[PDB]
Design a protein around this ligand. Structure first.
Ligand code: NA
Ligand code: NA
Ligand code: NA
Length: 274
């Protein structure tokens, strides 16, 4: 076009910067939401930190200028793309806050460029949802197939079932409406392919290679993440770590229980493991 080079990758990530400081906080979001999931955290960071937010896992893919690039077929490709973001935006070190599988994309990226990560703060993280005989991820095959439900048959129907289950609490809540809203900003074919990536991804083998400090935070009552997952990550990471299980419900507690989750997140961002 006449305004310049069509930068479609740039458009998919939608990198936004707010605040200022010597340290950059990078905020990654989980499947079904976008950078707006951090609306209650960001106002309490901007005084002290530069904050970089970006979108991923097919977020905002109904925007007709969004293209689902081939890199986005795997979580490793998301990790690669995160490293490119860090390079392009001149991040020499950062505090990486990753919600859900973005905690793992951050972890994978940190194995490659540990120099770029001061620490990882994981929120509602899992290295794998599907159970094995020896690993409790929280899902049997029947659960995965139920949760998938009408995702490609009837997206609109699936979303009304999916959103309240993941978020927890009541259907009419601002959080469920927000999650539903962001789910509708996803092209249904892209939501389907990312859903399948999410539920077939097994990142447990990466954990031992992680060396940067990891703060491991989750809700006690998360339908997607048993309480034992936090301890699993804690026992297997290769560097310093700490766990904080919050007396909250839901997979998106930063959106649905900010009164409890925000103060916990801020403590883990601002204070280092000794
Ligand atoms: Na580091
Ligand atoms: Na350890
Ligand atoms: Na340790």
């Amino acid at each position: 076009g006449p305004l310049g080079s069509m930068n479609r990758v740039e458009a998919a990530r939608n990198v936004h910067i707010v605040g200022s400081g010597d340290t950059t906080v990078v905020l990654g979001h989980g499947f079904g939401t976008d950078q707006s999931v951090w609306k209650h955290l960001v106002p309490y960071l901007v005084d002290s930190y530069r904050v970089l937010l970006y979108d991923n896992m097919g977020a905002g893919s109904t925007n007709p200028e969004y293209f689902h690039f081939e890199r986005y077929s795997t979580l490793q490709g998301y990790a690669h793309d995160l490293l490119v973001i860090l390079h392009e935006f001149n991040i020499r070190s950062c505090i990486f806050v990753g919600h859900s599988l973005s905690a793992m994309t951050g972890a994978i990226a940190s194995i490659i460029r540990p120099d770029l990560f001061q620490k990882i703060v994981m929120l509602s993280a899992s290295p794998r949802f599907l159970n094995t005989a020896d690993y409790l991820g929280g899902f049997e095959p029947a659960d995965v197939e139920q949760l998938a439900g009408a995702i490609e048959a009837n997206y609109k129907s699936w979303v009304s079932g999916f959103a309240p289950m993941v978020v927890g609490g009541d259907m009419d809540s601002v959080a469920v409406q927000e999650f539903s809203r962001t789910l509708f900003n996803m092209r249904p074919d892209i939501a389907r392919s990312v859903f399948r990536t999410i539920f077939t991804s097994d990142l447990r083998d990466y954990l031992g290679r992680v060396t940067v400090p990891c703060h491991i935070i989750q809700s006690s009552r998360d339908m997607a993440v048993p309480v034992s997952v936090a301890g699993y990550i804690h026992n297997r990471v290769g560097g310093r770590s700490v766990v904080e299980v919050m007396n909250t419900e839901g997979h998106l507690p930063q959106l649905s229980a900010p009164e409890v989750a925000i103060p916990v997140l801020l403590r883990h961002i601002k204070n280092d493991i000794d």
